[PDB]
Amino acid sequence: PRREDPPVLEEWYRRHLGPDIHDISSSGVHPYSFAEIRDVCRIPAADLDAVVMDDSVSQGGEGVRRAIADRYAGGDADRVLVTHGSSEAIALTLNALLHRGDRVVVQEGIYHSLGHYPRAAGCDVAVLPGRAVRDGEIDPDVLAGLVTPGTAAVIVNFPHNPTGVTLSPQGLRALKERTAATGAVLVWDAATAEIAHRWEVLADPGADGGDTVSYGTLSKTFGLPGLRVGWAVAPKELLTATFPLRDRTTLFLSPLVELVAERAVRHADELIGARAAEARHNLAHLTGWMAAHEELVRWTPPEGGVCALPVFRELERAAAGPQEVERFCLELLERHRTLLVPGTAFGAPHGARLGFGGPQEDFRAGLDGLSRFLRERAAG
């Protein structure tokens, strides 16, 4: 068999998800039960039972496309592609968009699949450093100097998994001005767009009707990672260009899943709202906890989404092999029943992803486990 290393993030979860743990590691809000979905999204059993289990269509079912378009594409259902998670939307669209030798600017520490496709296509990749994004804007000098005339694409995820850094409306305006000026295609992964802490929720660039590619998903802010539904918003020409690859990989989605997805999107405010309130309660708690532990841990406060990247000063002050944070997280898990994702999953060897979108009581228990672990290490 052809050997390739799996991404660190997904391998970590294959090995360490399990029973009797405090999972404070996710970039998403905790999942709804199907019961709760039927209640909130008003899905009578009769509506499900009526679905004929036949083929759907290559672009995604019209009903689910329309629901997504009304929210993120300015009402244009022709500019939505409905996929098996946003994972599939990324794979399909980046395969069609990116060409060998294209110059592409990619955010530092971006979700693995977004970093993979430009490499695989043989693009000339330039990295936009994380430090260049602060207070809601990309540093103007860096923006102008990295995104240059003839750049093919700029690929970003805001709010950012795992740091929670995001843009303000002004910051996004400036980014769109520069991609317009240079002819670059903005590729905008908006997985966690619906939860913003510092500024307002950012309008999807896909609503403009131009040459941008946007992603979203039900996995991170809707409580539906296990529905496996995401999307791209992009010009129809790009979306139809994905069909040859879709025809040899997934064909199309299930009409049963598409019914549930349409209803979820139509009730987005309810699904997101309940979970976002819980996430905000946990973030308040986390803010105090971080302050109380400032001698041992530092961070950038998250500005959007439901996770952050605390940095453990012990790992920096020694600056050990980058594997050290993996061993830290393994020991935290085994001794204190508490799960983070080691920063090696995100190109951040001194930090770990800490999620605050999970249930409140378990979140506090996870924080207690980590506090005890940190104290043990500081002492002795």
Ligand X SMILES: Cc1ncc(COP(=O)(O)O)c(CN[C@@H](CCCNC(N)=[NH2+])C(=O)O)c1O
Give yes or no for residue 225 binding ligand X (CB under 6 A).
yes
**Per the structure block, which two tokens stand in for 113?**
């699949």
The DSSP line for 121-143 is TT-EEEEE-GGGEETTEE-HHHH
Out of 40, 62, 74, 87, name the contact with a copy of itself by CB under 8 A.
Answer: 87
Size of the site for a copy of itself (CB under 8 A): 68
The residue among 187, 177, 171 whose CA lies nearest residue 123 is 187
Nearer to ligand X, 214 or 219 (CB): 219
Q: Is 298 exposed, middle or buried (0-12, 13-18, 19+ CB in 10 A)?
A: middle
Cα gap 54→271, rounded to integer Å: 28
**Which range binds ligand X by CB under 6 A, 7-15, 97-105, 130-138, 283-291?**
7-15
Q: Is 333 exposed, middle or buried (0-12, 13-18, 19+ CB in 10 A)?
A: buried
Out of 2, 101, 295, 380, name the contact with a copy of itself by CB under 8 A.
Answer: 2
Give yes or no for residue 11 binding ligand X (CB under 6 A).
no
Q: Which of residues 196-235 bind a copy of itself (CB under 8 A)?
A: 223-228
Find out whether the peptide bond into 162 is cis, omega within 30 degrees of 0. Answer: yes
Instruction: Return the residues preceding each gap in the chain, C–N over 2.5 A, or none.
Output: none
Out of 41, 64, 80, 88, name the contact with a copy of itself by CB under 8 A.
Answer: 88
Q: Is 157 annotated as a binding-site member?
A: no
Out of 48, 180, 284, 318, name the contact with a copy of itself by CB under 8 A.
Answer: 48
In angstroms, what is the minimal distance from the CB of 230 to ligand X? 4
Assign 3-class secondary structure to 199-223: CCCCCCHHHHCCCCEEEEECCCCCC
Q: Which of residues 252-291 bind ligand X (CB under 6 A)?
A: none
Nearer to ligand X, 251 or 318 (CB): 251
**Which range binds ligand X by CB under 6 A, 9-17, 235-243, 296-304, 329-337?**
9-17
Nearer to ligand X, 233 or 374 (CB): 233
Q: Half-sphere exposure of 65 toward its Cβ, with a 13 Å CA cutoff? A: 20
Give yes or no for residue 17 binding a copy of itself (CB under 8 A).
yes
Cα gap 248→263, rounded to integer Å: 29
The DSSP line for 178-192 is HHHHHTPEEEEE-TT
Q: Which of residues 346-365 bind ligand X (CB under 6 A)?
A: none
Give yes or no for residue 379 binding a copy of itself (CB under 8 A).
no
Give yes or no for residue 107 binding ligand X (CB under 6 A).
no
Q: Is 176 annotated as a binding-site member?
A: no
Q: Which of residues 241-280 bind a copy of itself (CB under 8 A)?
A: 241, 243-245, 247-257
The residue among 230, 327, 233, 221 whose CA lies nearest residue 270 is 221
**Which range binds a copy of itself by CB under 8 A, 92-100, 163-171, 274-282, 337-345?**
92-100
Q: Which residues are near ligand X by CB under 6 A?
A: 9-10, 13, 27, 55, 85-87, 111, 157, 161, 189, 191, 217, 219, 225, 230, 251
